[PDB]
């Protein structure tokens, strides 16, 4: 319908009317996040066997 077409044009004007930053800046900020929190990620920075539930941990709450 004409309603269906005009719905799209109103939306596609709405999607074009967002401002965008450069992909250089986009990537650089993500890489900033990983580098930063890499210390706390245990799949990258493993913790002691006794402090990990699925290896040698004995006491539990």
């Amino acid at each position: 319908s004409i309603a269906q077409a005009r719905k799209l044009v109103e939306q596609l004007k709405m999607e074009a009317n967002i401002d965008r930053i450069k992909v250089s800046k986009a990537a650089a900020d993500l890489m900033a996040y990983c580098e930063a929190h890499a210390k706390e990620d245990p799949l990258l920075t493993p913790v002691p066997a006794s402090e990990n539930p699925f290896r040698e941990k004995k006491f539990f709450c």
């Binding site: 596609l12 930053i21 450069k22 990537a27």
Partner: protein, 338 residues
Amino acid sequence: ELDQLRQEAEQLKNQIRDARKACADATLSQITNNIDPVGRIQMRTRRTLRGHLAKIYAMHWGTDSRLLVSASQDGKLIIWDSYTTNKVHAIPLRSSWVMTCAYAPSGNYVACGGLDNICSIYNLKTREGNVRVSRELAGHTGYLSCCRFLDDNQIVTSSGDTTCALWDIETGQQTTTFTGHTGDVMSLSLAPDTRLFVSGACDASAKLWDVREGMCRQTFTGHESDINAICFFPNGNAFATGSDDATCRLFDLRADQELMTYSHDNIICGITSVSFSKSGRLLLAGYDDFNCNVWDALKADRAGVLAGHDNRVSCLGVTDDGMAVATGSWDSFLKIWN
């Protein structure tokens, strides 16, 4: 008059392509080219959770990084204790055709649903102890594909009726509806701040929705086939998708375009699930070839493979605390890895 608007319908589409190419000054793989690789990640399977009598379709960790729900073709939801293998609850459903499930952040409730076209909310601790149904959410005229909680009294669902919807669980009505997709919606993922959420569909497009306002801000195409699963990056300014084309894709919101593609020539089957590690460096993808792969999200290299299921890995998810990964499969077992 019908013609008159279909020219502007594509005059604006081309305004968008050109608008986006202006940002494409450099690629992520270029910027990342400097950092050290993550190196081989050889995770071993640390638990096998055995109990379900047929295919697993959907799983979900609790916020405590210990308990997890799993939906199954056998018509039961199960709540497991990952640390010990013990089952906390075996909930038998009122409909055999379940597809999704979800754990409340509070941990007081779980949800599920499927070809029944209803999202059923279960109360994990009644005034006695018996697990009972506390609400059914009828509304969708299509199968329930996925759903996630905001809080105890709010839930968001996606359906094969080609729409999504935010619920008010007490009254059991739809606060907001999310029309826009022209094909079956398949997955969604909440932003950590919750004000946003992304969705994926069989129209090969994903859409960022403005939860509170109730409308589509951005639409990210690029995939050549049905987007089967979707996942937010921990900071909430980018997300990943999985599709039947055999590729994952990282999309950035502020850049408003695709950043990265993860796809070896050897990997030819579809992707059934996606999840980031706690930092976001690792992107874990579940495949129809029985294996979950592990991608270096920044460098687009394959770090390693989680291989120990006899059938499709139908779902996965990392814990909040990043200690372990869980894979659920059509072989009927879940497995915890690290």
